[PDB]
Symmetry: C3
Subunit: 214 residues, 3 copies
């Protein structure tokens, strides 16, 4: 049967033999517990822990498998559950996250499956009853898209934002609701004004049009 060769110095020339001290240094480079057994000379495979998308982990026995898992199931704290095509971060300094996500322009962020960006443009103001109200944050560096036309996403668990001239905070539904209520509250007062003014001689007020008939 085969016999071990003893008393072999480290090889230097390319046609020199290699000893266990040399191979062991390379197995140490793999890490993950890879090692040479001192009794049998058997080589233990490395064991690398990778993180699945369902709250579990797996161990794999070679580097390629670990890289392939990183490029499919993700890394700890950053998971996409998909087999669909890769995201594309095409714009300079853009970020694209999730299957089929596409960040097209500089500084853009695409967040979510099938989220796609278009070039951001600023909105300076709104005009209501001929009065123009100016906005904060009117020269966007780019956009964060959370979807695409017909496949938009809601954004949920958003804390109420500041309301004021300089606010660049997002606004939630409880905030628009208060505003809506105030409009109807004002309307009730207007209908009062209309009716009390009507009171006369057959005179009337029509809330449908606001017109007093007298």
């Amino acid at each position: 049967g085969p016999v071990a060769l003893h008393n072999v110095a480290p090889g230097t020339a390319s046609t020199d033999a290699v000893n266990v001290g040399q191979l062991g240094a390379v197995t140490t480079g793999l890490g993950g517990g890879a090692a040479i057994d001192p009794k049998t000379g058997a080589v233990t495979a490395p064991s690398y822990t990778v993180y699945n998308a369902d709250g579990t982990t797996s161990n794999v026995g070679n580097v390629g498998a670990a890289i392939d898992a990183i490029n499919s199931t993700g890394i700890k704290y950053f998971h996409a559950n998909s087999t669909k095509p890769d995201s594309q971060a095409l714009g300079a300094d853009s970020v694209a996250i999730g299957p089929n996500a596409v960040a097209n322009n500089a500084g853009d962020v695409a967040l979510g499956s099938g989220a796609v960006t278009s070039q951001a443009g600023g909105t300076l103001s709104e005009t209501i009853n001929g009065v123009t109200y100016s906005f904060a944050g009117t020269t966007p560096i780019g956009t964060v898209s959370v979807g695409a036309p017909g496949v938009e996403r809601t954004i949920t668990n958003v804390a109420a934002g500041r309301i004021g001239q300089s606010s660049t905070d997002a606004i939630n539904g409880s905030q628009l609701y208060g505003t809506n209520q105030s409009i109807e509250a004002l309307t009730d007062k207007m209908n009062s004004l209309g009716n009390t003014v009507a009171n006369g001689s057959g005179a009337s007020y029509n809330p449908q049009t606001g017109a007093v008939n007298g």
Copy 2:
């Protein structure tokens, strides 16, 4: 004591000796500067650069350590600073980011520590003074959650969005502020109406609108 064995051809059978040439090719496979010293035979470890979450990097000397860093401190441009449990992307094609984040449904996104999604639902319109105003983006494919009930997040540094019937842009507080101002300005105008109307007749009540 030990002597080097020379003039060894590449091994082919499992019980053949290997030479330095063969070991060096495997060593090249590690990369990161791993090598065999052509004079002493000493093996240089690989050195891999990994990215911490604090603006610094570290170097590690084996592949396992690099994978563990990737799965703890993260990768360049994608960092979570945590030791709490992993995120979970449970929905098909979902994305979950940060400790304890959970994306529960198809196409959902969970963004942030403890961010949890619930199934998305559409909102078609609002009714004000008996008139119905229809919305854009009424059929959501999923939701982006940035928190959970009682542990919500503000969203900050949001540029003003388009305001129009087809707009699916988010709005910021300066935009709602303008609208709120228009309501009070309209109210000043109405108060003037009530008062000037009273004068032609008498008193006007701003509390109820009555003349």
Copy 3:
């Protein structure tokens, strides 16, 4: 020039190594790394990494793969940049994209140059002397999508629930309907003013 046969696996550090032992190391590399059973030639590993432009590349060593991961990214998570790293400085914070900084516990910074500051709550608004209370008034952190002077729009946002307890984001079509309702009411008030005047000043509301 000549091969040594019938070598058993080495155990002590000064023992010779055989192909079976070296083969286990190539096997640990994966990616097709191998020793040719005919010639003894070593095949490099081949690892697929994912670029930021919808392409992939193959690299021939583990260092090159780690460097790709730390530059062009991983499948489904790409930043296209050569700028400095993001920094997640707060406990349990997340920072994504070049120069992004999450400064506080539980913060998220999302995008190139996105920076957070400590979140604060907003409780209510007061309109015509009436105070309206809000939902989600005690935030545990913020998601910043930019910084002062370099804000980001947020786009393709589905319409949010409108109601007292709603913590959904609102889109522009929703504020638009509300603005329309204001001008509709104003039309009615202008009719009120004109008909009562039968001058009516629509700019001030005054009837003379």
